[PDB]
Amino acid sequence: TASPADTNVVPAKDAPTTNSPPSTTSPNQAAADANQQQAGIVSSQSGPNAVGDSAPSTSVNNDGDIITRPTSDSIAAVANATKPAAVVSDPQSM
């Protein structure tokens, strides 16, 4: 009778962007389409509402850039690109 599943419905974790497919071309439109198809709506019934919409995607950075890996790794990548040797061997060292 008093089914909790019908009373305690709340958005799941990572809800706003979970369905976003991994792509770089048009992530927001692609994510929007994925949400629409995931929700069970078919394009033939949504009509004109499906053409211009866009939704948040994981491929888009908070700054508004196309990202292909977690931002920490991007930070790690640039950091690792610059690591001069701590101790070097040269004849004139005192």
Binding site: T1, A2, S3, P4, N8
Partner: protein, 49 residues
């Protein structure tokens, strides 16, 4: 049906200050149950697990 059974029911479900001075993790929800007077059927609160 028997006075003994009722006594235990009180001794279990309706003693409140008992067993106070110890760590107690078994905190339940607010509503334990309801009883409908017109039919006498008792409804237990669902437990989410």
């Amino acid at each position: 049906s028997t006075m003994s059974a009722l006594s235990e029911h009180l001794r279990s479900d309706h003693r409140d200050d008992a067993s106070t001075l110890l760590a107690t993790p078994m905190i339940n929800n607010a509503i334990r149950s309801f009883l409908t007077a017109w039919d006498g059927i008792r409804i237990l609160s669902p437990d989410v697990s």
